[PDB]
Design an enzyme around this catalytic site. Structure first.
Site, PDB file in Angstrom:
ATOM      1  N   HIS A  97      60.041  56.814  10.511  1.00  0.00           N
ATOM      2  CA  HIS A  97      61.328  57.436  10.788  1.00  0.00           C
ATOM      3  C   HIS A  97      61.289  58.177  12.119  1.00  0.00           C
ATOM      4  O   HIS A  97      60.367  58.956  12.372  1.00  0.00           O
ATOM      5  CB  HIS A  97      61.704  58.396   9.663  1.00  0.00           C
ATOM      6  CG  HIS A  97      62.492  57.759   8.563  1.00  0.00           C
ATOM      7  ND1 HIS A  97      63.619  57.002   8.799  1.00  0.00           N
ATOM      8  CD2 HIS A  97      62.315  57.766   7.221  1.00  0.00           C
ATOM      9  CE1 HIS A  97      64.100  56.567   7.648  1.00  0.00           C
ATOM     10  NE2 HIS A  97      63.327  57.014   6.677  1.00  0.00           N
ATOM     11  N   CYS A 125      63.031  54.518  15.779  1.00  0.00           N
ATOM     12  CA  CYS A 125      64.275  54.685  16.509  1.00  0.00           C
ATOM     13  C   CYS A 125      64.378  56.122  17.000  1.00  0.00           C
ATOM     14  O   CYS A 125      63.745  57.028  16.459  1.00  0.00           O
ATOM     15  CB  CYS A 125      65.472  54.330  15.625  1.00  0.00           C
ATOM     16  SG  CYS A 125      65.780  52.551  15.479  1.00  0.00           S
TER      17      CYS A 125
END
Ligand SMILES: [Ca+2]
Ligand SMILES: [Cl-]
Length: 258
Positions: A110, A166
């Site tokens: 994450h 990301c």
């Protein structure tokens, strides 16, 4: 895409930094967090580190005894990507760093941030990564990964980072950034040869898979040829652009050797 006359990175101090001739100690720290059981769980991130692992071992001459792999499906509480585990493992990668080493770092999990236009007080710390225990330990911020993995590097040592996450475009607080949207460049230094691949600034794990396949299907590339090949490799199935960040100016026509 490879240049006609491509000379490998010059083996001398430049202007202040120096590259790595990619022959010294080859270590790797690989992190894949799936967040199993949680309500923000992911899939394939653990598989991503495996992919980088065996590619590093086969096409890049990385001995497994030099590679630490933190994935939350393991059984050994020391190897579960907890924050202290991630941190200690980063200190190990950088420990005994000498000129011309070939360190590698990889993270698949994450990404997020605590934003700020430029970094201060929220000193450099816009981009972040989430350890598996992040809900009860907090994220691992942009700045701490600079202090650990970049600073302790001496002149000449290469750290090659790869982020599949990301929102991790400046996640190592790297001063320079090279993209391929019309050849963009986007600016307390370190003479180390620190480079990093990331995407966009949510389909995760795209950047590693494109890298193996760009480097398996064409092992001789330049810093430039790498980025166009990654963009063609990504722009088809994944919406994001390759970003090669760095701690020093890079004449991109040089030979990228991993
Ligand atoms: Ca940053
Ligand atoms: Cl998986």
């Amino acid at each position: 895409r490879p240049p006609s006359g491509m000379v490998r990175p010059p083996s001398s101090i430049q202007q202040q930094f120096q590259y790595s001739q990619m022959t010294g100690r080859r270590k790797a720290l690989l992190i894949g967090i799936n967040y199993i059981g949680s309500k923000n769980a992911l899939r394939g991130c653990i598989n991503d580190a495996h992919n980088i692992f065996n590619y590093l071992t086969t096409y890049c001459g990385y001995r497994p005894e030099d590679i630490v792999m933190l994935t939350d499906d393991q059984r050994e509480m020391v190897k579960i990507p907890l924050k202290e585990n991630i941190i200690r493992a980063m200190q190990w990668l950088v420990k005994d760093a000498q000129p011309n080493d070939a360190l590698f770092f990889h993270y698949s999990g994450h990404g997020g941030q605590t934003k700020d236009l430029d970094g201060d007080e929220e000193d450099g710390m816009d981009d972040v990564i989430y350890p598996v225990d992040f809900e009860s330990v907090g994220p691992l911020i942009d700045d701490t990964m600079h202090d650990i993995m970049v600073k302790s590097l001496p002149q000449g040592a290469r750290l090659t980072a790869l982020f599949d996450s990301c929102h991790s475009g400046t996640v190592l607080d790297l001063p320079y950034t090279y993209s391929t949207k019309g050849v963009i460049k986007e600016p307390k230094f370190s003479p180390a040869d620190v480079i990093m691949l990331s995407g966009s600034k949510q389909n995760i794990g795209a950047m590693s898979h494109a890298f193996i396949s760009v480097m398996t299907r064409q092992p001789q590339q330049s810093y430039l040829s790498l980025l166009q090949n990654l963009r063609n490799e990504l722009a088809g199935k994944y919406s994001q652009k390759p970003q090669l960040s760095a701690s020093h100016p890079i004449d991109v026509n040089l030979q990228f050797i991993m």
